[PDB]
Enzyme design. Structure first.
Site, PDB file in Angstrom:
ATOM      1  N   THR A 133      29.218  21.551 -19.451  1.00 44.13           N
ATOM      2  CA  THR A 133      29.356  22.670 -18.153  1.00 44.13           C
ATOM      3  C   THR A 133      30.350  21.961 -17.432  1.00 44.13           C
ATOM      4  OG1 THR A 133      27.417  21.612 -17.211  1.00 44.13           O
ATOM      5  CG2 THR A 133      27.212  23.852 -18.143  1.00 44.13           C
TER       6      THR A 133
ATOM      7  N   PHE B 188      24.880  26.634  -9.944  1.00 39.88           N
ATOM      8  CA  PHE B 188      24.175  25.335 -10.284  1.00 39.88           C
ATOM      9  C   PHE B 188      22.741  25.833 -10.365  1.00 39.88           C
ATOM     10  CE2 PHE B 188      28.118  23.205  -8.935  1.00 39.88           C
ATOM     11  CZ  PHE B 188      28.445  22.427  -9.974  1.00 39.88           C
TER      12      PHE B 188
ATOM     13  N   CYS C 168      20.683  22.895 -10.572  1.00 40.34           N
ATOM     14  CA  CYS C 168      20.984  21.696 -11.485  1.00 40.34           C
ATOM     15  C   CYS C 168      21.062  20.185 -10.644  1.00 40.34           C
ATOM     16  CB  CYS C 168      22.794  21.718 -11.514  1.00 40.34           C
ATOM     17  SG  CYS C 168      23.547  20.478 -12.245  1.00 40.34           S
TER      18      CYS C 168
HETATM   19  C1  HEM Z   1      30.050  22.227 -13.478  1.00 38.77           C
HETATM   20  C2  HEM Z   1      29.238  21.658 -14.064  1.00 38.77           C
HETATM   21  C3  HEM Z   1      27.668  22.060 -14.200  1.00 38.77           C
HETATM   22  C4  HEM Z   1      27.099  23.439 -13.947  1.00 38.77           C
HETATM   23  C5  HEM Z   1      27.724  24.799 -13.753  1.00 38.77           C
HETATM   24  C6  HEM Z   1      25.655  23.261 -14.268  1.00 38.77           C
HETATM   25  C7  HEM Z   1      24.863  24.328 -14.089  1.00 38.77           C
HETATM   26  C8  HEM Z   1      23.555  24.441 -14.093  1.00 38.77           C
HETATM   27  C9  HEM Z   1      22.542  25.469 -13.866  1.00 38.77           C
HETATM   28  C10 HEM Z   1      23.228  26.899 -13.866  1.00 38.77           C
HETATM   29  C11 HEM Z   1      21.285  25.194 -14.271  1.00 38.77           C
HETATM   30  C12 HEM Z   1      20.060  25.859 -14.006  1.00 38.77           C
HETATM   31  C13 HEM Z   1      19.515  26.047 -15.404  1.00 38.77           C
HETATM   32  C14 HEM Z   1      18.500  27.065 -15.233  1.00 38.77           C
HETATM   33  O1  HEM Z   1      17.810  27.509 -14.178  1.00 38.77           O
HETATM   34  O2  HEM Z   1      17.883  27.659 -16.415  1.00 38.77           O
HETATM   35  C15 HEM Z   1      21.378  23.573 -14.452  1.00 38.77           C
HETATM   36  C16 HEM Z   1      20.369  22.666 -14.372  1.00 38.77           C
HETATM   37  C17 HEM Z   1      20.340  21.489 -14.941  1.00 38.77           C
HETATM   38  N1  HEM Z   1      21.483  20.717 -15.085  1.00 38.77           N
HETATM   39 FE1  HEM Z   1      23.392  21.429 -14.748  1.00 38.77          FE
HETATM   40  N2  HEM Z   1      25.200  21.911 -14.530  1.00 38.77           N
HETATM   41  C18 HEM Z   1      26.706  21.282 -14.363  1.00 38.77           C
HETATM   42  C19 HEM Z   1      26.721  19.846 -14.640  1.00 38.77           C
HETATM   43  C20 HEM Z   1      25.348  19.065 -15.039  1.00 38.77           C
HETATM   44  C21 HEM Z   1      25.339  17.667 -14.896  1.00 38.77           C
HETATM   45  C22 HEM Z   1      26.803  16.563 -14.755  1.00 38.77           C
HETATM   46  C23 HEM Z   1      24.065  17.288 -15.227  1.00 38.77           C
HETATM   47  C24 HEM Z   1      23.724  15.872 -15.483  1.00 38.77           C
HETATM   48  C25 HEM Z   1      24.374  14.631 -15.213  1.00 38.77           C
HETATM   49  C26 HEM Z   1      23.328  18.451 -15.289  1.00 38.77           C
HETATM   50  C27 HEM Z   1      21.932  18.327 -15.596  1.00 38.77           C
HETATM   51  C28 HEM Z   1      21.209  19.247 -15.338  1.00 38.77           C
HETATM   52  C29 HEM Z   1      19.666  19.437 -15.357  1.00 38.77           C
HETATM   53  C30 HEM Z   1      18.775  18.098 -15.793  1.00 38.77           C
HETATM   54  C31 HEM Z   1      19.251  20.506 -14.884  1.00 38.77           C
HETATM   55  C32 HEM Z   1      17.923  20.997 -15.085  1.00 38.77           C
HETATM   56  C33 HEM Z   1      17.158  20.831 -13.611  1.00 38.77           C
HETATM   57  C34 HEM Z   1      15.691  20.947 -13.755  1.00 38.77           C
HETATM   58  O3  HEM Z   1      15.467  22.224 -14.300  1.00 38.77           O
HETATM   59  O4  HEM Z   1      14.969  20.220 -13.093  1.00 38.77           O
HETATM   60  N3  HEM Z   1      24.196  19.367 -15.072  1.00 38.77           N
HETATM   61  N4  HEM Z   1      22.567  23.182 -14.273  1.00 38.77           N
END
Ligand code: HEM
Ligand code: HEM
Lengths: 441, 441
Positions: free
Chosen positions: B254, B379, B386
């Site tokens: 992402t 996010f 996120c």
């Molecule tokens: C532009 C970059 C990123 C975007 C657009 C993005 C987007 C998202 C989105 C939309 C979700 C929600 C998923 C859901 O509700 O099903 C999410 C969850 C998550 N993302 Fe990201 N993400 C990005 C970068 C990152 C990075 C750099 C990391 C880790 C270093 C990361 C780790 C996670 C984790 C662990 C979750 C789950 C959190 C939870 O449910 O407790 N993401 N992300």
């Protein structure tokens, strides 16, 4: 190692720095000048004002620091007694009353207070609905009418009827004047003493009569029927009276200040106000908000938390070191050394919140998960934290939510933020016009 | 009342509409035709795609809707397990790992990751500085090299050394294959054996790294020594492996898409590129950007937010109704009814952004308060948002800022936006030339 200290006044050391009508803001400017910690000395008194989350997170270690009664709390103790807020943790009546009163302050308990809160909130809305054109709202005054009446009604089913009064109920005048004399003692009288003792009796007389006079959904019932699980003991009538006085003091002015600061920041940030108004209109779909609907006012709560960030209305709490300890790896503290947590400075810790600490951005609280530990302490810390937090936040969310739903607000005077300081903070002279949205109740 | 639904395929209902290489963009076109909500039916599956802030702001009510595992996340769960991204909110390991990992993802935590981020960013810059004349940059490829290496280094102190490779590290090759097979199951024996071979390759390295792991400034350390404040329990090794895999998936693809879309939009909007370059030159005065300097890259952050608006690289998240509820006052949902938030469509809601929703205008994000609630969800939402957001934005801001500082960029092919769709979005084939500004590191 060497601890900064603001300017001294000879034998009076730093105490005359508190000889000012805005001592928290004076302490904040000192903290701006001296940094995360500065020694504050007075005749027979040494304390240390903490302003960074780095040191306050250590001060908030309950294994190392316990709640101290600041000089203000000791003076409030002269009429709040061993009530929850002015009692030491080691006093039997603190934990006893804490255990008895904690269930009546839970998030589950707000469901029973909600209707009475709505009662006063409707009186606030109706008052503003009944204002004539070009008439304005004295916000902290009306917020104080609202919060005091709410805690009076929710606390011991007593109606101060502040919206039926210009001069507050005789108890309120005595309480504020007692609180005023208590604060003037900080900055420091035979007449003031007699008046203080008169105001103590006025406060005691009303509460003890109410305790004697008195099943309702209020704190008074829980205090008469509640037994501390630990000691098996109920609160005695004297401590019950101190708790009501405590709740009357604690539960009205900090909450009115929060509402008053919240509305101040709303009218100074139209984007935030629009966003909060849109949520209030969307969530409060009924003529009378429900408990569940007040919980759905997420952004309103975000506004309230950001208002509490910039101006935590209970702006400080005191700690003492339980044992010899070192604060931040460079400030050795002996047993009993006193610490002051300058909450507004803590909430301006740029290392926690970024450089925009002075900006009102409720979006800082969009995700409460992003807030580091002990960075945000408007309600104190640990077991000595505010027992009325959920009460204050629920009331303020409901009332601000109803305000945003029923009125458009105008900062018609372009109000210049003037923070009057008692033992709490309020935007003095803050006035708005409310254009009703004509939404019935 | 009646919910629109795109064309059906008999017994397969709407499912063959996803049998396409650009299903999000197909879903966006369906949303363009059907509006803010449309029912999507498949054998044994019904979901609803939300595209308006009007409905998504309600879907984002966490008291009414919880994160659902989309079919993609359920397939990703086959190797991401109960990691943060593929665990249900009610799974004990979510909140446990959420509580343990939240401090290591705060804005305060980015200070400790910054040096490792700079490490990889300098490697990216040096790669481009070392390109010969008329050689071009394969942008998503290099952005994936950078983001993969950044999360490998910051997360587990492991250097994938992607800038030393043409073919990605065997773990990444298996992961991309695994994510591909996970996505290919949506459109639906050798695949399964291949899918199991990619899982074992992923598990072995991570479990080895977890076994090999000294104290470092990485997420692995925090997961090995971190205790859930709630249960007092640390993550077991199995979940740690799922979290690393999760971060290895979630933490780079992402973010690389964001960087690639950001640069795509910069070279397509030379004024925006100039403005962001001028800020990079103004702010990044040192050979190595500091953490504080990355925070001063406001317009770069605005550039990233507008790229995330137009092409959120995690283009959807799934929600389920916790109780019977009504969406927008006209769509009754039963308990467990599924919602899909079509994020790119949300971010094109003309009622929120104006008619110029398709324009790359980073200025839309100068004030986050002027953005309505839940209008911008790149996010995710709430507690399931996120956790790596600040990580992704800090890395992307640093890297884009260094890119803008050190290079003038040429859209030498007049690159036609072609968005490859995996479970994330990337501008496939996006290539640029970078003329170095000859500014040393
Ligand atoms: C532009 C970059 C990123 C975007 C657009 C993005 C987007 C998202 C989105 C939309 C979700 C929600 C998923 C859901 O509700 O099903 C999410 C969850 C998550 N993302 Fe990201 N993400 C990005 C970068 C990152 C990075 C750099 C990391 C880790 C270093 C990361 C780790 C996670 C984790 C662990 C979750 C789950 C959190 C939870 O449910 O407790 N993401 N992300
Ligand atoms: C925005 C509103 C409020 C704020 C900012 C606030 C703030 C605080 C703070 C900082 C403390 C810690 C005092 C110390 O450590 O010395 C405290 C304690 C306390 N507050 Fe509040 N408070 C608010 C509302 C209320 C309400 C509505 C009530 C009662 C209905 C209440 C009752 C108490 C009590 C009883 C304590 C002492 C708890 C204990 O020591 O066991 N407060 N408050």
């Amino acid at each position: 190692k060497e601890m900064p200290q603001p300017k001294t006044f000879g034998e009076l050391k730093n105490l005359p720095l508190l000889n000012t009508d805005k001592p928290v803001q004076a302490l904040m400017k000192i903290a701006d000048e001296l940094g995360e910690i500065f020694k504050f000395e007075a005749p027979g008194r040494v304390t240390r004002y903490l302003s960074s989350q780095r040191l306050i997170k250590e001060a908030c270690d309950e294994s190392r620091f316990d709640k101290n009664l600041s000089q203000a709390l000791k003076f409030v103790r002269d009429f709040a007694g061993d009530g929850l807020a002015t009692s030491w943790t080691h006093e039997k009546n603190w934990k006893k009353a804490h255990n008895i009163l904690l269930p009546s302050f839970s998030q589950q308990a707000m469901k029973g207070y909600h209707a009475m809160m709505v009662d006063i909130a409707v009186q606030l809305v109706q008052k503003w609905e009944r204002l004539n054109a070009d008439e304005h709202i004295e916000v902290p005054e009306d917020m104080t009418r609202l919060t005091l009446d709410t805690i009076g009604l929710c606390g011991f089913n007593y109606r101060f009827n502040s919206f039926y009064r210009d001069q507050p109920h005789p108890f309120i005048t005595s309480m504020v004047r007692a609180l005023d004399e208590a604060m003037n003692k900080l900055q420091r009288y035979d007449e003031n003493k007699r008046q203080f003792q008169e105001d103590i009796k006025v406060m005691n007389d009303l509460v003890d009569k109410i305790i004697a006079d008195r099943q309702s959904d209020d704190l008074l019932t829980h205090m008469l029927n509640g037994k501390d699980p630990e000691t098996g003991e109920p609160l005695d009538d004297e401590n019950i009276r101190y708790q009501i006085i405590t709740f009357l003091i604690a539960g009205h002015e900090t909450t009115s200040g929060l509402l008053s600061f919240a509305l101040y920041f709303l009218v100074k940030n139209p984007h935030v106000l629009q966003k909060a108004a849109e949520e209030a209109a969307r969530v409060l779909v009924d003529p009378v908000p429900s408990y569940k609907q007040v919980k759905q006012l997420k952004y309103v709560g975000m506004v309230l938390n950001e208002a509490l960030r910039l101006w935590p209305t209970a702006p400080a709490f005191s700690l003492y070191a339980k044992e010899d300890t070192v604060l931040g790896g460079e400030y050795p503290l002996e047993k009993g050394d006193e610490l002051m947590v300058l909450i507004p400075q803590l909430h301006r810790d740029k290392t926690i919140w970024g450089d925009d600490v002075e900006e009102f951005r409720p979006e800082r609280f969009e995700n409460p998960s992003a807030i580091p530990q002990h960075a945000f302490k408007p309600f104190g810390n640990g077991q000595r934290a505010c027992i009325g937090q959920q009460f204050a936040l629920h009331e303020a969310t409901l009332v601000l939510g109803m305000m945003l739903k029923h009125f458009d607000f105008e900062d018609h005077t372009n109000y210049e933020l003037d923070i009057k300081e008692t033992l709490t903070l309020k935007p003095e002279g803050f006035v708005v016009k409310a254009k009703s949205k004509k939404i019935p109740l």
